[PDB]
Short mmCIF file of C-alpha atoms and ligand atoms in Angstrom, two decimals:
data_model
loop_
_atom_site.label_atom_id
_atom_site.label_comp_id
_atom_site.label_asym_id
_atom_site.label_seq_id
_atom_site.Cartn_x
_atom_site.Cartn_y
_atom_site.Cartn_z
CA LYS A 1 -16.26 -17.18 -13.32
CA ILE A 2 -16.97 -14.34 -16.05
CA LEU A 3 -13.08 -13.23 -15.55
CA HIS A 4 -11.97 -16.65 -16.42
CA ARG A 5 -13.98 -16.38 -19.79
CA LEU A 6 -12.66 -13.02 -20.10
CA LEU A 7 -8.79 -14.41 -19.51
CA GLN A 8 -9.04 -17.26 -22.15
CA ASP A 9 -10.83 -14.95 -25.03
CA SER B 1 9.85 -17.11 -20.42
CA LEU B 2 10.12 -14.10 -22.39
CA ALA B 3 9.81 -11.21 -20.60
CA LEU B 4 13.36 -11.69 -18.78
CA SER B 5 14.89 -11.58 -22.25
CA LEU B 6 13.32 -8.07 -23.48
CA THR B 7 15.67 -5.24 -23.31
CA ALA B 8 14.32 -2.29 -21.27
CA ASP B 9 13.42 -0.41 -24.39
CA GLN B 10 12.06 -3.60 -25.61
CA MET B 11 10.39 -3.52 -22.41
CA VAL B 12 8.94 -0.23 -22.99
CA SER B 13 7.61 -0.63 -26.29
CA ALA B 14 5.39 -3.95 -25.28
CA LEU B 15 4.28 -1.73 -22.37
CA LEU B 16 3.03 1.53 -24.45
CA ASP B 17 1.64 -0.51 -27.31
CA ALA B 18 0.10 -2.38 -24.61
CA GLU B 19 -1.94 0.58 -23.60
CA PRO B 20 -5.80 0.25 -23.48
CA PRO B 21 -8.35 2.62 -24.88
CA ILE B 22 -10.07 5.76 -23.37
CA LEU B 23 -13.50 4.63 -23.18
CA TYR B 24 -15.93 7.51 -23.53
CA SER B 25 -19.06 7.62 -20.66
CA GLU B 26 -22.38 6.70 -21.23
CA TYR B 27 -23.49 10.15 -20.30
CA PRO B 28 -25.64 14.75 -20.61
CA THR B 29 -28.64 17.16 -19.78
CA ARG B 30 -28.29 15.66 -16.09
CA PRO B 31 -27.41 17.19 -12.90
CA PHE B 32 -26.21 14.05 -11.07
CA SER B 33 -28.05 12.24 -8.58
CA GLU B 34 -26.36 10.08 -6.35
CA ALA B 35 -27.88 6.89 -8.68
CA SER B 36 -26.81 8.38 -11.54
CA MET B 37 -23.07 8.98 -10.65
CA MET B 38 -22.40 6.13 -9.50
CA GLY B 39 -24.19 4.10 -12.44
CA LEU B 40 -21.46 6.17 -14.52
CA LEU B 41 -18.69 5.43 -12.79
CA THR B 42 -19.83 1.66 -12.47
CA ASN B 43 -20.63 1.24 -16.19
CA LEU B 44 -17.49 3.29 -17.18
CA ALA B 45 -15.76 0.39 -14.70
CA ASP B 46 -17.26 -2.74 -16.19
CA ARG B 47 -16.32 -1.25 -19.63
CA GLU B 48 -12.62 -0.74 -18.94
CA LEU B 49 -12.43 -4.00 -17.09
CA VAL B 50 -12.77 -5.60 -20.45
CA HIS B 51 -9.62 -3.97 -22.02
CA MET B 52 -7.71 -4.44 -18.52
CA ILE B 53 -7.47 -8.38 -19.13
CA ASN B 54 -5.97 -7.74 -23.02
CA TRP B 55 -3.82 -5.23 -21.64
CA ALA B 56 -3.07 -7.33 -18.48
CA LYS B 57 -2.45 -10.37 -21.32
CA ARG B 58 0.05 -8.08 -22.91
CA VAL B 59 2.24 -7.71 -19.93
CA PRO B 60 5.20 -9.29 -20.71
CA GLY B 61 5.58 -12.19 -18.22
CA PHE B 62 1.64 -12.06 -16.95
CA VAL B 63 0.60 -15.11 -19.86
CA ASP B 64 3.85 -17.50 -18.37
CA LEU B 65 1.03 -17.74 -15.40
CA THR B 66 -1.31 -19.88 -14.60
CA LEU B 67 -4.98 -18.90 -15.18
CA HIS B 68 -5.86 -19.06 -11.62
CA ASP B 69 -2.76 -16.70 -10.76
CA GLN B 70 -3.55 -14.62 -13.31
CA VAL B 71 -7.63 -14.41 -12.27
CA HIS B 72 -6.01 -13.80 -8.30
CA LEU B 73 -3.94 -10.87 -9.36
CA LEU B 74 -6.65 -9.45 -11.63
CA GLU B 75 -8.80 -10.01 -8.62
CA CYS B 76 -6.35 -8.34 -5.76
CA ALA B 77 -5.68 -5.04 -8.23
CA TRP B 78 -8.46 -4.52 -10.66
CA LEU B 79 -9.67 -0.94 -8.78
CA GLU B 80 -6.15 0.34 -8.37
CA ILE B 81 -5.51 -0.54 -12.00
CA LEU B 82 -8.60 1.99 -12.66
CA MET B 83 -7.42 4.48 -10.05
CA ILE B 84 -4.09 4.79 -11.34
CA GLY B 85 -5.27 5.01 -15.20
CA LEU B 86 -7.91 7.45 -13.56
CA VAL B 87 -4.95 9.86 -12.21
CA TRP B 88 -3.15 9.56 -14.63
CA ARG B 89 -5.87 10.70 -17.46
CA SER B 90 -6.45 13.56 -14.58
CA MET B 91 -2.55 14.92 -14.23
CA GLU B 92 -3.29 17.95 -17.15
CA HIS B 93 -6.34 18.66 -15.20
CA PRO B 94 -5.38 20.27 -12.13
CA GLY B 95 -8.22 19.75 -9.69
CA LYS B 96 -10.31 17.63 -11.70
CA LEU B 97 -10.87 14.04 -12.23
CA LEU B 98 -10.95 12.48 -15.85
CA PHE B 99 -12.95 9.48 -15.69
CA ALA B 100 -13.61 10.03 -19.17
CA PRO B 101 -12.96 12.98 -21.84
CA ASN B 102 -16.87 13.93 -21.43
CA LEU B 103 -16.59 13.27 -18.00
CA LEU B 104 -14.31 15.70 -16.16
CA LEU B 105 -15.12 16.03 -12.32
CA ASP B 106 -13.94 18.00 -9.37
CA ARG B 107 -14.53 17.81 -5.84
CA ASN B 108 -18.24 19.03 -5.72
CA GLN B 109 -19.36 16.02 -7.78
CA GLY B 110 -18.11 13.84 -5.15
CA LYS B 111 -20.84 15.45 -2.47
CA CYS B 112 -23.45 13.98 -4.70
CA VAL B 113 -22.47 10.72 -3.40
CA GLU B 114 -22.27 10.04 0.36
CA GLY B 115 -18.46 8.64 1.06
CA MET B 116 -17.05 9.77 -2.05
CA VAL B 117 -15.56 12.92 -1.59
CA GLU B 118 -12.78 11.55 0.71
CA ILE B 119 -12.18 9.48 -2.24
CA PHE B 120 -12.10 12.45 -4.74
CA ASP B 121 -9.83 13.86 -2.56
CA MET B 122 -7.37 11.10 -2.17
CA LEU B 123 -7.39 10.76 -5.98
CA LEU B 124 -6.78 14.46 -6.75
CA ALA B 125 -3.83 14.36 -4.70
CA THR B 126 -1.86 11.56 -5.99
CA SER B 127 -2.80 13.30 -9.91
CA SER B 128 -1.49 16.09 -8.16
CA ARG B 129 1.38 14.23 -6.90
CA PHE B 130 2.20 13.40 -10.22
CA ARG B 131 2.20 16.47 -11.72
CA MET B 132 4.57 17.71 -9.07
CA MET B 133 7.03 14.43 -9.71
CA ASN B 134 6.47 15.19 -13.90
CA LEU B 135 5.86 11.70 -14.36
CA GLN B 136 6.35 10.55 -17.92
CA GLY B 137 4.08 8.07 -20.04
CA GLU B 138 6.99 5.26 -20.17
CA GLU B 139 7.12 5.46 -16.16
CA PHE B 140 3.26 5.11 -15.88
CA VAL B 141 3.00 2.11 -17.51
CA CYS B 142 5.53 0.66 -15.81
CA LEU B 143 4.07 1.71 -12.55
CA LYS B 144 0.85 0.13 -13.44
CA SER B 145 2.13 -3.52 -14.36
CA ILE B 146 4.17 -3.25 -10.99
CA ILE B 147 0.94 -2.73 -9.00
CA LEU B 148 -1.08 -5.70 -11.41
CA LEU B 149 1.96 -8.26 -10.66
CA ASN B 150 2.81 -7.10 -6.93
CA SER B 151 -0.46 -6.31 -5.53
CA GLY B 152 -1.44 -10.11 -5.10
CA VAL B 153 1.73 -12.09 -4.96
CA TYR B 154 1.46 -12.32 -1.19
CA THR B 155 -1.58 -14.64 -1.45
CA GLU B 156 8.31 -21.38 -8.35
CA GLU B 157 5.50 -19.23 -9.88
CA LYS B 158 6.17 -16.34 -7.27
CA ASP B 159 10.06 -16.74 -7.87
CA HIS B 160 9.19 -15.54 -11.79
CA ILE B 161 6.85 -12.95 -10.78
CA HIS B 162 9.86 -11.74 -8.78
CA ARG B 163 11.83 -11.86 -11.44
CA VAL B 164 9.47 -10.00 -13.98
CA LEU B 165 9.22 -7.08 -11.03
CA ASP B 166 13.04 -7.04 -11.09
CA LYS B 167 13.06 -6.62 -14.75
CA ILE B 168 10.43 -3.48 -14.67
CA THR B 169 12.53 -1.98 -12.06
CA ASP B 170 15.37 -2.33 -14.40
CA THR B 171 13.29 -0.50 -17.29
CA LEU B 172 11.98 2.30 -14.60
CA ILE B 173 15.81 2.67 -13.84
CA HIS B 174 16.42 2.65 -17.38
CA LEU B 175 14.22 5.76 -18.38
CA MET B 176 15.80 7.79 -15.66
CA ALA B 177 18.93 7.34 -16.67
CA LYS B 178 18.50 7.66 -20.31
CA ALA B 179 16.21 11.27 -18.98
CA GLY B 180 19.62 12.56 -18.28
CA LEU B 181 19.10 12.28 -14.00
CA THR B 182 22.10 11.12 -11.85
CA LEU B 183 22.70 7.81 -9.91
CA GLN B 184 21.19 9.35 -6.65
CA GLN B 185 18.42 10.76 -8.49
CA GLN B 186 17.45 7.84 -10.16
CA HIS B 187 17.19 5.52 -7.01
CA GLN B 188 15.26 8.59 -5.35
CA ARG B 189 12.68 9.10 -8.00
CA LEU B 190 12.29 5.31 -8.26
CA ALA B 191 11.59 5.77 -4.05
CA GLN B 192 9.68 8.40 -4.65
CA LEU B 193 7.32 6.40 -7.24
CA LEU B 194 7.32 3.37 -5.50
CA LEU B 195 6.06 4.82 -2.44
CA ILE B 196 2.84 6.52 -4.02
CA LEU B 197 1.94 2.70 -4.86
CA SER B 198 1.22 2.66 -0.82
CA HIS B 199 -1.58 5.25 -1.42
CA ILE B 200 -2.94 4.04 -4.53
CA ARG B 201 -3.41 0.69 -2.70
CA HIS B 202 -4.78 2.79 0.53
CA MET B 203 -7.71 4.69 -2.34
CA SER B 204 -8.26 1.09 -3.71
CA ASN B 205 -9.36 -0.65 -0.41
CA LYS B 206 -11.36 2.62 0.56
CA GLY B 207 -13.36 2.27 -2.87
CA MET B 208 -13.46 -1.35 -2.65
CA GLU B 209 -15.16 -0.55 1.11
CA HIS B 210 -17.50 2.35 -0.52
CA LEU B 211 -18.27 0.01 -3.36
CA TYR B 212 -19.69 -2.98 -0.81
CA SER B 213 -21.90 -0.62 0.79
CA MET B 214 -23.48 0.22 -2.79
CA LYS B 215 -24.47 -3.29 -3.33
CA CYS B 216 -26.02 -3.39 0.00
CA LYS B 217 -27.91 -0.31 -0.71
CA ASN B 218 -28.89 -1.92 -4.35
CA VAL B 219 -29.60 1.78 -5.53
CA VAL B 220 -26.69 1.18 -8.50
CA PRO B 221 -27.04 -1.57 -10.55
CA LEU B 222 -23.63 -3.49 -10.76
CA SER B 223 -22.59 -6.02 -13.44
CA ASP B 224 -22.12 -9.70 -12.76
CA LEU B 225 -18.69 -9.17 -13.59
CA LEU B 226 -18.28 -6.52 -10.98
CA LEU B 227 -19.90 -8.14 -8.11
CA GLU B 228 -17.50 -10.97 -8.84
CA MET B 229 -14.53 -8.56 -8.98
CA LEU B 230 -16.36 -7.18 -5.28
CA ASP B 231 -16.61 -10.56 -3.70
CA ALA B 232 -12.72 -11.82 -4.20
CA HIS B 233 -11.87 -8.98 -1.30
CA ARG B 234 -14.08 -10.29 1.24
CA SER C 1 16.87 21.02 10.56
CA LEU C 2 19.64 18.31 11.70
CA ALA C 3 18.10 15.48 9.62
CA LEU C 4 19.66 16.65 6.52
CA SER C 5 22.98 17.13 7.62
CA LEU C 6 22.99 13.29 8.83
CA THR C 7 25.57 11.16 7.02
CA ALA C 8 23.69 7.95 6.02
CA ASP C 9 26.16 5.98 8.77
CA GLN C 10 24.57 8.60 10.89
CA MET C 11 21.00 8.16 10.02
CA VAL C 12 21.60 4.23 10.57
CA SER C 13 23.11 4.97 14.24
CA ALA C 14 20.11 7.44 15.03
CA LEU C 15 18.00 4.73 14.16
CA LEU C 16 19.06 2.09 15.67
CA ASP C 17 19.51 3.92 19.14
CA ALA C 18 15.98 5.03 18.78
CA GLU C 19 14.55 1.34 18.89
CA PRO C 20 11.68 0.88 21.13
CA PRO C 21 11.68 -2.34 23.78
CA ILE C 22 10.32 -5.76 23.02
CA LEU C 23 7.13 -5.82 25.48
CA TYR C 24 5.97 -9.20 26.87
CA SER C 25 2.22 -10.05 27.18
CA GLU C 26 0.17 -9.71 29.88
CA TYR C 27 -0.34 -13.47 28.98
CA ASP C 28 -1.43 -16.33 31.64
CA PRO C 29 -0.67 -19.61 29.90
CA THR C 30 -2.92 -21.38 32.46
CA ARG C 31 -6.00 -19.49 31.08
CA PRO C 32 -7.86 -21.15 28.44
CA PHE C 33 -8.18 -19.30 25.51
CA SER C 34 -11.40 -17.25 24.05
CA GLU C 35 -12.08 -15.03 21.58
CA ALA C 36 -12.50 -12.12 24.39
CA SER C 37 -9.10 -12.78 25.91
CA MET C 38 -7.07 -13.34 22.87
CA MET C 39 -8.25 -10.06 21.34
CA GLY C 40 -7.54 -8.70 24.70
CA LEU C 41 -3.79 -9.51 24.56
CA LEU C 42 -3.35 -8.17 21.48
CA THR C 43 -5.32 -4.74 22.14
CA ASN C 44 -3.28 -4.92 25.48
CA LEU C 45 -0.18 -4.99 23.99
CA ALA C 46 -0.81 -3.09 20.97
CA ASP C 47 -2.08 -0.36 23.66
CA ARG C 48 1.31 -0.30 25.60
CA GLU C 49 3.13 -0.28 22.19
CA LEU C 50 1.77 2.99 21.29
CA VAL C 51 3.49 4.34 24.11
CA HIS C 52 6.92 3.48 22.91
CA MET C 53 6.32 4.33 19.50
CA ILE C 54 5.58 7.79 20.36
CA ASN C 55 8.89 8.58 22.24
CA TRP C 56 10.50 6.47 19.14
CA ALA C 57 8.56 8.71 16.27
CA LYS C 58 10.30 11.87 17.99
CA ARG C 59 13.82 10.45 17.90
CA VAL C 60 13.04 9.55 13.78
CA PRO C 61 15.27 12.23 11.98
CA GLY C 62 13.07 15.49 10.49
CA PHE C 63 9.59 13.84 12.56
CA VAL C 64 10.64 16.74 15.33
CA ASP C 65 10.41 19.77 12.64
CA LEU C 66 6.86 19.04 11.79
CA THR C 67 4.31 20.97 13.76
CA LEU C 68 2.43 18.75 16.51
CA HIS C 69 -0.88 18.79 13.86
CA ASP C 70 1.58 17.14 11.55
CA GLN C 71 2.95 14.48 14.04
CA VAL C 72 -0.63 13.43 15.06
CA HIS C 73 -1.95 13.04 11.75
CA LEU C 74 1.37 11.10 10.66
CA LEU C 75 0.54 8.72 13.63
CA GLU C 76 -3.27 8.54 13.29
CA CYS C 77 -2.41 7.42 9.63
CA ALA C 78 0.50 4.86 9.95
CA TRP C 79 0.43 2.98 13.89
CA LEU C 80 -0.94 0.06 12.64
CA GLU C 81 1.68 -0.34 9.88
CA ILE C 82 4.48 0.33 12.06
CA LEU C 83 3.04 -2.13 15.02
CA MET C 84 2.61 -4.99 12.17
CA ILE C 85 5.77 -4.61 10.38
CA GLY C 86 7.49 -4.70 13.89
CA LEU C 87 5.34 -7.56 14.54
CA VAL C 88 6.73 -9.32 11.42
CA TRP C 89 10.37 -8.53 12.05
CA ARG C 90 10.40 -9.86 15.48
CA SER C 91 8.82 -13.41 13.79
CA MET C 92 11.09 -13.49 10.63
CA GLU C 93 13.10 -16.57 12.63
CA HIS C 94 10.06 -17.96 13.77
CA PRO C 95 8.35 -19.84 10.43
CA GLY C 96 4.95 -20.22 10.62
CA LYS C 97 4.46 -18.49 13.91
CA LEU C 98 4.10 -14.88 15.11
CA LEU C 99 6.11 -13.18 17.82
CA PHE C 100 3.69 -10.69 19.20
CA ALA C 101 5.43 -10.92 22.82
CA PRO C 102 8.72 -13.32 23.34
CA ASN C 103 5.63 -14.81 25.81
CA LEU C 104 3.12 -14.60 23.06
CA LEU C 105 4.32 -17.17 20.19
CA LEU C 106 1.02 -17.90 17.81
CA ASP C 107 0.56 -19.43 14.60
CA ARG C 108 -2.81 -19.79 12.06
CA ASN C 109 -4.84 -21.79 14.13
CA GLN C 110 -4.63 -19.79 17.16
CA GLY C 111 -5.83 -17.14 14.78
CA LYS C 112 -9.30 -19.30 14.02
CA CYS C 113 -10.37 -18.54 17.31
CA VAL C 114 -11.16 -14.85 16.50
CA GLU C 115 -13.39 -14.21 13.53
CA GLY C 116 -12.05 -12.59 10.79
CA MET C 117 -8.00 -12.81 11.89
CA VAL C 118 -7.08 -16.40 10.10
CA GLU C 119 -7.01 -13.65 6.64
CA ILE C 120 -4.76 -11.11 8.95
CA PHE C 121 -2.74 -13.91 10.35
CA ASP C 122 -1.38 -15.25 6.81
CA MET C 123 -1.18 -12.25 5.32
CA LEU C 124 1.47 -11.38 8.17
CA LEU C 125 3.11 -14.33 8.08
CA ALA C 126 3.37 -14.38 4.33
CA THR C 127 5.25 -10.76 5.11
CA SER C 128 7.62 -12.67 7.64
CA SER C 129 8.40 -15.08 4.96
CA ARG C 130 9.08 -12.42 2.66
CA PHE C 131 11.34 -10.66 4.99
CA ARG C 132 13.49 -14.01 5.33
CA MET C 133 13.76 -14.84 1.86
CA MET C 134 14.96 -11.46 1.26
CA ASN C 135 17.36 -11.83 4.52
CA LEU C 136 16.13 -8.36 5.54
CA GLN C 137 18.39 -6.80 7.75
CA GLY C 138 17.82 -4.55 10.99
CA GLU C 139 19.62 -1.44 9.35
CA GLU C 140 17.14 -2.06 6.55
CA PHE C 141 13.96 -2.55 9.00
CA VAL C 142 14.37 0.74 11.05
CA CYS C 143 14.74 2.62 7.63
CA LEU C 144 11.54 0.94 6.12
CA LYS C 145 9.67 1.87 9.54
CA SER C 146 11.04 5.25 9.56
CA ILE C 147 9.47 5.24 5.75
CA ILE C 148 6.15 3.93 6.93
CA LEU C 149 5.62 6.53 9.53
CA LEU C 150 6.61 10.10 7.06
CA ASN C 151 4.88 8.57 3.99
CA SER C 152 1.77 6.96 5.02
CA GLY C 153 0.10 10.02 5.87
CA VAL C 154 1.20 12.61 3.61
CA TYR C 155 -1.38 13.09 1.51
CA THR C 156 -3.50 13.61 4.44
CA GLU C 157 6.09 23.45 2.57
CA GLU C 158 6.03 20.76 5.08
CA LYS C 159 5.37 18.37 2.90
CA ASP C 160 8.67 19.66 0.83
CA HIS C 161 10.29 18.93 4.22
CA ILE C 162 9.16 15.20 4.40
CA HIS C 163 10.04 14.25 0.72
CA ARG C 164 13.83 15.71 1.61
CA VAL C 165 13.91 13.61 4.42
CA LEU C 166 12.21 10.53 2.79
CA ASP C 167 14.83 10.78 -0.12
CA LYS C 168 18.21 10.59 2.68
CA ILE C 169 16.42 7.33 4.05
CA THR C 170 16.63 6.19 0.23
CA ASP C 171 19.84 7.29 0.16
CA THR C 172 20.77 5.33 3.39
CA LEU C 173 19.32 1.96 2.18
CA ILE C 174 21.21 2.46 -1.04
CA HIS C 175 24.30 3.54 1.02
CA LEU C 176 23.70 -0.18 3.02
CA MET C 177 22.86 -2.07 -0.10
CA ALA C 178 26.23 -0.73 -1.69
CA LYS C 179 28.24 -1.55 1.79
CA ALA C 180 27.06 -5.08 1.79
CA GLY C 181 28.73 -5.87 -1.58
CA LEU C 182 25.53 -5.62 -4.17
CA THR C 183 26.01 -4.10 -7.25
CA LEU C 184 24.28 -1.20 -8.67
CA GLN C 185 21.75 -3.15 -10.74
CA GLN C 186 21.14 -5.05 -7.36
CA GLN C 187 20.78 -2.44 -5.75
CA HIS C 188 17.89 -0.88 -7.15
CA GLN C 189 16.41 -3.81 -7.04
CA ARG C 190 16.58 -4.51 -3.34
CA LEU C 191 15.22 -1.12 -3.09
CA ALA C 192 12.17 -1.85 -5.05
CA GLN C 193 11.53 -4.75 -3.40
CA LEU C 194 11.52 -3.71 -0.34
CA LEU C 195 9.34 -0.29 -0.96
CA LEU C 196 7.00 -2.79 -2.80
CA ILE C 197 6.31 -4.32 0.61
CA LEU C 198 5.12 -1.30 2.01
CA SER C 199 2.23 -1.78 -0.38
CA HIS C 200 1.55 -4.89 1.22
CA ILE C 201 1.58 -3.63 5.16
CA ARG C 202 -0.83 -0.85 4.03
CA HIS C 203 -2.98 -3.52 3.02
CA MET C 204 -2.84 -5.36 6.63
CA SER C 205 -3.11 -2.03 8.12
CA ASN C 206 -6.38 -1.63 6.10
CA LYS C 207 -7.87 -4.82 6.91
CA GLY C 208 -6.80 -4.79 10.55
CA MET C 209 -8.44 -1.26 11.05
CA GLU C 210 -11.64 -2.73 9.80
CA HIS C 211 -11.44 -5.78 11.66
CA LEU C 212 -10.61 -3.71 15.15
CA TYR C 213 -13.87 -1.39 14.47
CA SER C 214 -15.42 -4.22 14.06
CA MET C 215 -14.30 -5.49 17.82
CA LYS C 216 -15.80 -2.52 18.89
CA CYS C 217 -19.15 -2.54 17.56
CA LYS C 218 -19.14 -5.95 19.24
CA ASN C 219 -17.64 -4.31 22.74
CA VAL C 220 -16.58 -7.62 23.76
CA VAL C 221 -13.14 -6.74 23.87
CA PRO C 222 -11.97 -3.59 26.23
CA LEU C 223 -10.12 -1.20 24.17
CA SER C 224 -8.11 1.61 25.64
CA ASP C 225 -8.95 5.29 24.88
CA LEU C 226 -5.87 5.94 23.32
CA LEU C 227 -6.62 2.93 21.20
CA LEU C 228 -10.19 3.97 20.33
CA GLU C 229 -8.77 7.75 19.33
CA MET C 230 -6.68 5.79 16.81
CA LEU C 231 -9.39 3.78 15.55
CA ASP C 232 -11.70 7.18 14.94
CA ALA C 233 -9.21 8.85 12.92
CA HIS C 234 -9.58 6.56 10.09
CA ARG C 235 -13.45 6.55 9.97
CA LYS D 1 -6.51 13.92 22.04
CA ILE D 2 -4.44 11.67 23.85
CA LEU D 3 -1.77 11.41 21.03
CA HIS D 4 -1.55 15.34 20.82
CA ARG D 5 -0.72 14.86 25.14
CA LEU D 6 2.20 12.37 24.75
CA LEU D 7 3.67 13.53 21.94
CA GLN D 8 4.48 17.13 24.17
CA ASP D 9 5.02 15.51 27.19
O1 7EL E 1 -18.18 3.07 -5.11
N1 7EL E 1 -17.40 3.85 -5.67
C1 7EL E 1 -16.36 2.45 -6.62
C2 7EL E 1 -16.39 3.31 -7.77
C3 7EL E 1 -15.91 2.34 -8.71
C4 7EL E 1 -15.09 2.53 -9.90
C5 7EL E 1 -14.34 3.73 -9.54
C6 7EL E 1 -13.44 3.86 -10.65
C7 7EL E 1 -12.32 4.35 -10.80
C8 7EL E 1 -11.15 4.65 -12.12
C9 7EL E 1 -11.93 4.69 -13.35
O2 7EL E 1 -11.16 5.02 -14.38
C10 7EL E 1 -13.33 3.92 -13.67
C11 7EL E 1 -13.95 3.91 -12.44
C12 7EL E 1 -14.42 4.51 -8.67
CL1 7EL E 1 -13.76 6.18 -8.56
C13 7EL E 1 -15.22 4.06 -7.45
O3 7EL E 1 -15.02 4.99 -6.50
O1 7EL E 2 -9.05 -5.91 15.81
N1 7EL E 2 -7.34 -5.94 16.33
C1 7EL E 2 -6.55 -5.97 15.42
C2 7EL E 2 -4.91 -5.90 15.50
C3 7EL E 2 -5.02 -5.30 16.65
C4 7EL E 2 -3.40 -5.26 17.12
C5 7EL E 2 -2.47 -6.27 16.15
C6 7EL E 2 -0.72 -5.76 16.71
C7 7EL E 2 -0.25 -6.23 15.90
C8 7EL E 2 1.15 -6.04 15.95
C9 7EL E 2 1.25 -6.17 17.73
O2 7EL E 2 3.20 -5.58 17.92
C10 7EL E 2 0.11 -6.24 18.48
C11 7EL E 2 -0.87 -5.86 18.13
C12 7EL E 2 -3.19 -6.90 15.44
CL1 7EL E 2 -2.10 -8.00 14.19
C13 7EL E 2 -4.45 -6.82 15.07
O3 7EL E 2 -4.79 -7.76 14.09
#
């Protein structure tokens, strides 16, 4: 998910 | 954890400094078509979402959750969080919705998109309600954090989320006691504030349903991030 | 108005004595379940429950002082929230089971017999678990249910009176918590925990309302005229 | 409306 990358970055 | 150690004054300063920026609309010379107005709203929402994640990570207690719990809470409350922010910005503009400093809309603009006037009226009603209640910024950042943690809590880790929710409640009461309100006025105002979150949830469900119909119409381009936030509700 | 001239103990007793009965289901346990029959049981039960909810709303302090138009609007907005929080309350001591009626006990496995009903079941089951963990008292329940009636439709002078009654119900909830030996910090916290649950009941009602309109468009379930009027009030 | 009738009965 795009939301995964945003939370980790 | 670390949020449980914060004093209520520290909790406020942590939330105020975590406030996302106010983004400008990509607008200009446009009487709004139904496709142009929804384009502005979705484009603004997509860019506002990127800042919401960084704001959520700065919410005391949110970093302590697992990645999946963080995703689930954001997937449930993202539209509520955008709406209560829009409602907050529009307080000083009665009868108008300040989507951006360069995008101030009234209910007649809602007529440019079918099914939008009803959501406009509800948002304006919440904004006027915040105006009558004389909602302070310190209280607003507490309500927005509560929405983030509470909206998806019912879908060990939940014991911590409820412990952080108790902390924000203590912070709200501290703010009201600091403003000179009596004990009776404190729990009355706390009750009045939290009951508005029930309507913020209602507007989100109406808005989430309206967004799905824009997808099946596919006249309005929706970002992949926005589609994934939408597919998490159905 | 008289709702303001009531003490907290008088407010509790008035709400308790106004409690509607627990209706039974037309459930034949010797009839094999089907998507049309199970939904027919839930809608038939809701239809008979609505009649008692109308007379329960009249005995809610402050509701009678409103115009009939305001009364119609509040009930059209909250009738499913009130049915669900009541269902959740009855099922509090039946973990993993929803007590629609004393003769109608259902778990989530039976919710799969109706498409889209599992998601509502689990939210109702989680709400009932949340009340059980919170050790929700009956006095607190009748307050929350009265809060739902007055609050769910208040956003579509009479509105100032409704908020005056709502503040009094808040004074009632705090009175109960102070009477139960809770500190002031625990009082505010429980008050917040209880009111935050109404956000989820609103969410469940929104979903249940959409699923109900889905049943109408398929028309495998016979819906009463009263139930169809409540359904057309949200859309 | 049915609701209107039941409320005044
Ligand atoms: O179908 N329409 C969906 C939709 C999406 C986003 C938004 C929205 C809300 C708040 C913002 O700050 C920014 C944007 C709204 Cl109001 C919508 O109605
Ligand atoms: O499509 N139909 C949806 C629906 C209707 C009623 C009910 C219901 C709820 C509580 C009652 O006491 C009685 C009934 C439920 Cl849970 C539903 O999901």
